[PDB]
């Protein structure tokens with residue numbers, strides 16, 4: 001249903017730091033002008049929204065959007081059906097949704113001058129990068145080429161404009177500062193579960209190594225693998241003989257071992273090939289990336305962990321894209337998330 | 350009272366257009382690359398959130414943040430008290446909150462290359478501008494100089510960092526394209542009331558002249574005045590005898606006359622000086638800007654309109670900043686908005 005009853009809701013800012021321009025502020029001179037004189041700027045802060053049900057049961061959930069996205073992807077699907085925010089408030093969890101630093105209602109650090117530049121210091125790069133509709137189409141596995149859909153597709157076809165409009169650029173904020181803001185949120189909230197997506201996968205793993213309050217991770221289609229420092233296994237190049245997946249993130253073993261203390265599930269949708277696919281770069285990228293993640297989870301398990309890989313087709317769900325939580329069967333995807341939380345008692349007080 | 354019962358909630362993207370890079374897309378090639386080759390980019394779209402109560406009464410309200418802000422300002426106050434979104438859902442109105450193009454979850458049009466540049470075309474300027482903590486302090490009339498409060502201030506003291514963290518830059522998207530997005534939303538919604546703030550004041554007036562569905566406007570501390578073309582009255586410079594207020598927006602009389610067909614209220618807080626204040630630029634700016642608005646409302650009334658100026662101190666509310674709807678007495682401010690809606694029948698079906 002669409003009905004939701006909230007004991008309370010709201011939003012707040014957390015994290016970040018300040019930087020300044022030179023000189024002193026004079027309230028008698030024109031305030032609106034091209035200058036950083038006497039100016040203090042808040043940068044790299046994060047936006048957080050929360051919705052709490054009446055009588056919550058179990059741990060709060062923190063939904064962390066993927067690369068170039070915002071908390072919108074947890075609010076509604078492109079065709080207007082309820083997102084995981086509504087579904088999990090109905091499932092009696094308090095739900096936090098974030099816009100990480102650099103995205104959406106999070107801070108974009110720019111000043112008076114060329115983008116990202118505060119006098120002679122470059123806070124973020126002036127040159128940006130960004131995905132396109134065509135690139136996102138194949139990245140998210142709607143189909144093998146733009147305009148084409150896989151046979152089984154759970155994408156909300158007809159709502160392509162709504163979907164692609166939710167995506168945008170990210171300034172070059174360091175990943176350390178993004179992780180820092182979420183660590184501060186986790187400290188503020190208490191024991192919780194991180195639910196991550198694509199680019200935020202590796203970031204949530206890092207947060208968990210810095211914050212014991214992270215009691216579980218569910219990562220949809222994580223984009224970068226993580227390994228103990230020096231211990232990255234052999235990972236093959238892509239079928240084009242030339243490209244590689246994202247360089248795996250390496251952390252000190254004492255931090256990596258903290259991942260063995262909590263339940264971790266990685267979730268993949270459909271249409272990731274089992275064999276090399278030289279004609280379709282992003283399908284082959286997903287094949288090797290998923291392979292790397294299987295090795296990462298094995299390394300966590302070998303250290304005593306509780307890490308698992310869930311392929312949605314093996315659970316009877318066919319046709320999911322890389323955004324299973326906004327696909328047409330997102331209610332069944334949510335059911336599998338509820339199952340994970342129930343298995344580990346994360347839905348009990 | 351923090352509880353809210355929602356018949357439905359969600360979010361969506363509306364408006365915008367597309368721009369394209371050179372050439373064609375090949376799915377065999379590396380997709381993550383420094384290139385706009387074959388790229389279609391969605392630009393200048395707007396984010397929209399809605400919450401609908403059970404059995405709504407009257408017209409939906411569209412809350413439109415001021416300059417450099419987002420829909421956060423209607424969700425919560427900096428100290429975590431309920432914003433107008435919650436208060437007006439409780440008051441039985443469906444509530445829309447937007448992040449306009451270029452702000453928050455709205456689109457920031459940038460690509461692969463220097464900020465805002467698509468190959469040789471400048472979609473928005475690479476050089477940005479932004480407010481500082483110090484400039485915003487005096488702009489919002491927390492006090493006469495940064496760090497100092499008016500004795501009577503309604504600002505939630507102690508939550509300064511939270512407040513200033515909600516503010517940011519806006520890329521140089523044309524005002525025409527911002528107005529266009531909101532006109533499209535109003536067409537989608539049907540009859541509605543615009544609630545604007547500061548920079549969005551003039552934009553909401555423009556929307557109403559294009560969209561008969563706007564049935565009322567309440568503008569908090571509007572920043573730019575509006576007049577019929579060629580009929581701008583004499584407006585003095587500031588007390589420094591150098592500076593001017595924002596050049597008034599001029600529109601054809603045929604469009605201006607549409608403003609006389611709906612109830613319009615401009616709402617101002619406290620601590621705007623009656624007399625020239627050369628020592629405090631932004632206090633003097635507000636004095637002359639409020640004067641210009643008084644003449645704008647007079648012009649609407651001479652065309653048969655019903656346009657009023659509400660100074661909160663005359664209603665018994667003292668110390669309000671330029672964000673009365675997040676101040677400590679925001680419940681009393683909300684009551685005055687409910688009074689306006691009820692008097693004009695905008696709270697009945």
Ligand SMILES: CCOC(=O)c1ccccc1S(=O)(=O)NC(=O)Nc1nc(Cl)cc(OC)n1
Pocket residue numbers: 066067068069129130131132134135136137139140197198199200223322380381382383384461
């Ligand atoms: C659902 C959001 O997708 C992701 O998080 C994601 C997934 C796989 C690989 C990279 C990313 S990413 O965002 O961290 N990075 C990109 O998607 N970058 C990127 N994507 C495309 Cl399609 C083109 C491009 O060109 C610069 N750059």
Ligand SMILES: CCOC(=O)c1ccccc1S(=O)(=O)NC(=O)Nc1nc(Cl)cc(OC)n1
Pocket residue numbers: 031032033034035112415416417418478479480481483484485486488489546547548549572671
């Ligand atoms: C409450 C949000 O405030 C407004 O909407 C507002 C109000 C009055 C004047 C200008 C703006 S504005 O945003 O459209 N513009 C600015 O506030 N710009 C701005 N403010 C400051 Cl204090 C400094 C500055 O330097 C470029 N530039």
